[PDB]
Assembly symmetry: D2
């Protein structure tokens, strides 16, 4: 397939390298405002193709997205000194809208995966300005945090991550919700299995939830940014579209009305295939989860409203 990447920073370039090794792209267009950087990146990957699958990689402009099966948006600006988070978001939101008109124009039939943070806020702004199908434009969301929570549990208990079931939903941020009420290992409720398993107990499941929601912060304090993790997750998402797998992924999707939350992009279990999102799984949230989920949706709508209100 043909893949376009808009924004070749640490994440865009890592995503490109990963997609290259997976071998999903026949043609790969790299688009960044700093054309010189995008071109050197393209030549570097081209110089490594003798060890990967043949791919037509090149640094282009928006007109090249024509024919793109998937367009990945890893484009954004860095917080200026003094700069406020609302301002920062104001700038990034404007970046999203700009890229959107162009993707809408040259690649109207593509599937777009937004990756920049805040992912749920920026995906909503991109979708709105784009005017495309909500089943074909979405954000990576909590996909990575869900997989990470399943992995921590699995390796502590002596199981394959394949045997562990858990979903983290909501804002891909401080207010995400691990849905512990539907968690299992071997289909057996996470609580029986948790205290059969030795290196498991209540204090440890809480650490996990905490180790996963802090992962990015901890990487950033040490090296300024995360790019590898999200790169591998974007490859994994693309992998489901590529083979039309219909796997369930907690992607940030535009929901018309899900458990009382409305008109916003947020993460919930949906199935992904070659035509984009298909089924949205409505979860049976216990009381505390429903409340946390709802509060999450409100933190997002508020942010959406402050920005929509500070550009008018």
């Amino acid at each position: 397939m043909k893949i376009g990447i808009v924004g070749l920073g640490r994440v865009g370039s890592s995503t490109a390298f990963a997609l290259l090794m997976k071998g999903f792209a026949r043609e790969m267009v790299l688009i960044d405002v700093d054309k010189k950087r995008a071109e050197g990146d393209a030549l570097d990957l081209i110089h490594g193709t003798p060890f990967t699958r043949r791919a037509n990689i090149y640094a282009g402009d928006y007109a090249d997205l024509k024919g793109s099966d998937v367009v990945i948006v890893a484009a954004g600006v860095p917080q200026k000194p003094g700069e406020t988070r609302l301002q920062l978001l104001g700038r990034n939101a404007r970046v999203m809208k700009e890229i959107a008109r162009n993707v809408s124009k040259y690649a109207p039939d593509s599937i777009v995966i937004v990756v920049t943070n805040p992912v749920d806020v920026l995906t909503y702004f991109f979708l709105k300005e784009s005017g495309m199908d909500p089943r074909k434009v979405f954000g990576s969301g909590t996909v990575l945090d869900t997989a990470r929570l399943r992995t921590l549990i699995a390796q502590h208990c002596g199981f394959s991550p394949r045997s562990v079931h858990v979903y983290v939903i909501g804002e891909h941020g401080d207010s995400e919700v691990p849905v512990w009420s539907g968690a299992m290992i071997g289909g057996i409720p996470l609580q029986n299995m948790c205290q059969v398993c030795q290196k498991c107990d209540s204090k440890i499941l809480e650490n996990f939830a905490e180790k996963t929601k802090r992962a990015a912060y901890e990487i950033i304090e040490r090296k300024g940014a995360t790019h590898y993790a999200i790169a591998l997750a974007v490859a994994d998402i693309v992998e489901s579209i590529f083979f039309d797998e219909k796997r369930v992924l907690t992607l940030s999707v535009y929901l018309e009305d899900y458990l009382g939350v409305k008109d916003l992009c947020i993460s919930v279990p949906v199935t992904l295939g070659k035509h984009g999102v298909e089924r949205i799984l409505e979860l049976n949230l216990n009381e505390e989860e429903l409340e946390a989920f709802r509060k999450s949706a409100s933190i997002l709508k508020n942010a959406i409203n402050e920005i929509t209100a500070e550009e008018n």
Copy 2:
């Protein structure tokens, strides 16, 4: 690793071909009473290695199992005319015991996977005569029927088989038990999800259970025997030992006491790694399931007792 296959009939040879393409064997010993057939089989696979991974394949005798990481038993005799099923089993049971002393003698440290039918009856006879660890000798059991039930459901509902959870336990035969009470799709109970999904409803889940328990009969009426399906399942089991995955598989294991069934080999969810079986998952069976499961164990013990009683 080094793999030995004892019994190169339709199943043994198909299993060997499949294992060859997976590339799990560095050395592969083929043992059959008809040495001429085993040798031509070995030369044929050797002649195809230019397209697979290097492997040291050869037709040997029992002394060659020395060093075997895994030994697969697909050895058995065909029902003579007039021959009774009890007699037939009497003969096959004797085959199992014979192979057992030899495997015990030359490859005491291997992991053995019994595949011949009746799988639960013959595995029990093999284990007993062998005197090996019940965590390292087991039968393939209901592994294939479980995967097949998950696949039917999945493709009818528009999900990846990875999102479907169901276990079929008990005798790998007419009395197997699909554990519908713990069935799910996306962690959501199979009943909500079943009637959200269009090509699903009660009459169809019953067909599935029936299509999967009859699969072998239907193949046999048409071509005399099954070998491809079981070959792919044996490869899959070996794959878990090979990468030490700890995946949950409904293998036929020797149970000391599981839900009131005792002293017999039967299928239940257990985890498989490089050292053999590790955890046995005790399932929460509803009333009717517990009863079906128990009846299953009784059909097996009876058969075990009739044969143990018609060789003394």
Copy 3:
């Protein structure tokens, strides 16, 4: 892609199983005159798909080849008692012509790979009766014998088969020609490298040529037939069409005039891609090789002429 297999005997079925594990077919049609056998084969492979890629496999009739990207012909009859080889060939040649009209009719745009023996004689009869493009219909030829000769040499000398160059051309039979004059290891002529390498010398390269041309005979004396080797080679050929690789393969192609041989199907280095054969490499044969090659072409034309003459 969609693949049809006409003739599900030991080879056709082995080829189907192998193609299934490679995961090249989205849809697979099995056609055999013994419909009951083809159907049980289809159900067996279907029952194993939970461990492979989703594939639409089924036993059909000629009308189903519609849309086939590749059609494999492993169909043929066995020598009756008393039966002469010329007669036998007369029968098989008639089988080839029959299958040809049907493939021409329902799948005129497919790429056909003939596999039945004698491969060069039967491919020529199939092509002629079919009236299709000589670049899209061909026989597997010496593909397997070439790979096997490269492998023997490589493993004796301590090199990867990738570093060994040799071609065996001509009749895929007793008169095949290993082109020793262009043989190399690391691009260094096989003779310098041969006596630098310890387990190499003139008497051993001759054994190799002999071990490879006798491989099938030796398998057949032991188990009645070869099927695994050729199955893996057919998968490998299909693999080049599938990813459009343009790899060089000694396939049995219809040559209009190559080194003085004319109007016949015989093996020589040609490149294979998604559209079939592309380039035919004309080799620089030394004196003795040119003579052996020519004699080979004459043994084939003679056989072609005796059969064309004993059906008129």
Copy 4:
């Protein structure tokens, strides 16, 4: 296997990410003088392991190399302003010696692959200070430039890179030597095949030689540095050790006396397996090639001598 990476700059980290996706490391130790950067890198890759194979990745110190099967050296310092190339090399050479004593001390049984530029000069300094086996310590050399030259030719002519033979030897720099005299496509000399092929002719083969020796310069002018290409090449080299393939690679090896060049590390065709380098292929260089090769060795020895002379 266990892999250590010393120097996590753009190349070290790219190499780590690539090795991670290949799945060659069971345990991966990242060592950089800037421990904070190495630790954030380790956490980032760990956070992405839910999508790759289980691996024990962590930022350590030299004592952790204990047990390392392979150690990769991508460590070096950047040219200070005003700084001379000889000085720069003086500094980097000292870095190499330092890392060497430590690798010699804690991981004496590992295979080391030097990657920093100048690769042939720095590998020689590392080997000398280390006192290890010349068959287990070497530089990546011209591996990437050789593959790139084979790829350019192949895709222009309509062949698989597998069918193209060419070696580039000598200094991995401005004086590298493409050995055109032994170049082939399908074993047919590159000159016949070159003017049979349309998009090939003398002016184009020269462009190729030029496009490949300038690749890094062109990347660097655009984005300051190359890391992806070399990362994929290092993975490929590790891949040969990992599966003990014995593939021929133009690695920078210590040569005692090869075609009159002596006591230096330079690139030539050697075979690589699980125990390191095995066979060194002595090439039949025509006149002009022998001269270019020799001049190459002299440019390297001179540099080696100026540095050995400006630290005493």
